[PDB]
Each structure stands twice: as C-alpha cells, then as structure tokens.
Amino acid sequence: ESHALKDPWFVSYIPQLTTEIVKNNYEGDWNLAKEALQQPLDYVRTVEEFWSTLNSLPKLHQLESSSTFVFARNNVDASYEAFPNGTRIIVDIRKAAMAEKATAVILSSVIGESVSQEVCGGKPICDVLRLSSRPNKESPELVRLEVWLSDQTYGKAVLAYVRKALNDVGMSQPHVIFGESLFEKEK
Ligand SMILES: [Ca+2]
Ligand SMILES: [Cl-]
Ligand SMILES: [Mg+2]
C-alpha cells in the first residue's frame, strides 16, 4: 500500500556549470545544459520511492560528489528563465553532522506538500529543489539546498516556514544559514 505523492518529481544529477560554460556551449540556456548533461535517477511517484531515492544519494557533506542533484515537480524546466517572477530560498548547511537530516526535512516539507498547504494556500509554488556540495574556506563541508519558487511573493513566508522547521529539530544559525535570491536580480 504505497502512498501517492500529490505530484511526481523527476530526480537527476548535473555536473557543475558556470555562466561562461553555459554561454559558450549551450547558447546561454541552463535548461538545455541540464537536458544535455543530466543523468536520471528516478521519477518518484510515492512516499516510499521518495525516501528510497533520497537515501541512495551520495553524502554531499563528505565530498562524495561535485554534482548538483535536482528534484523537479512534474519535470518542470530547472532554469531561472523557466521561473519568471520567481525566487530561490538558499539553505547553507555548514555542519556536516546535520546535512542529511536538514536535507530530509526540507525536501519532505515540499514534496509532502506541507509548504503548499501551510504557506501557499494549497497552490504548488515550490517546483524545484536542488542539493549541492559548495565548500568554501570558512565552511569546508558546506551543503547547499535551494528551494525554487514560481512566485516571489511567497519567498519570505516560505523562508520563515523552512527556518522554523529546521530550528524545531535542532538546526539553527550558525550551523545553517538562510538567504533569498530573486531570479531577476541574479540573472
Ligand atoms: Ca524539454
Ligand atoms: Cl536560524
Ligand atoms: Mg522508479
């Protein structure tokens, strides 16, 4: 007795890219780069499949992979340009011993529709989730989680909800950092 997800999520991994590499090889189109370079993992359709696929991922906090893992609702295009008026919520997890649980909390909150129900009036707004290793000199095991929203007017409220969710299960500054980045600004 599987439990269906509200929507299926297409899960893949992509190599690390840069604006210049995408400009020079993929006509500036990050979605084309993704289509050209991704490897599929699964199209998750049930709660059980979600957990199976998540548990199969590399330990990004142990530098097992340089790839970005993407979860895309209904296989939506995962480029900024496919999110007009959108924003990204960034969650940086500095503490390696918290990365797996933070990832589980954030991904399950969205894929299980808690964010939609509790923040967005039941409308699907969070349509892409990304997960990457992003070490820096201050934080050599940093994992970066991104939540991409189709409508920037929900950004502050989604951030607050996800922050509270993490705080409630033991994860707060300085172990995790939150930010928001409008797609129109970044572009
Ligand atoms: Ca296509
Ligand atoms: Cl915090
Ligand atoms: Mg499958």
In short:
By secondary structure, the chain is of the alpha+beta class.
Describe this structure as you would to a colleague.
The protein has one domain: RNA Cap, Translation Initiation Factor Eif4e (2-Layer Sandwich), CATH 3.30.760.10. Helix content is 35%, strand content 29%. Strands 2-1-3-5-6-4-7 form a 7-stranded antiparallel beta sheet. The radius of gyration is 16 Å and the shape is globular. It starts with a strand and ends with a helix. It is classed as translation. The entry lists the keywords RNA binding protein, CAP-4, translation. The assembly is monomeric.
What are its keywords?
187 residues; alpha+beta; RNA Cap, Translation Initiation Factor Eif4e; seven-stranded antiparallel sheet; 7 helices; binds calcium ion; binds magnesium ion; translation initiation factor activity; Eukaryotic translation initiation factor 4E type 5; TIF_eIF_4E; protein biosynthesis
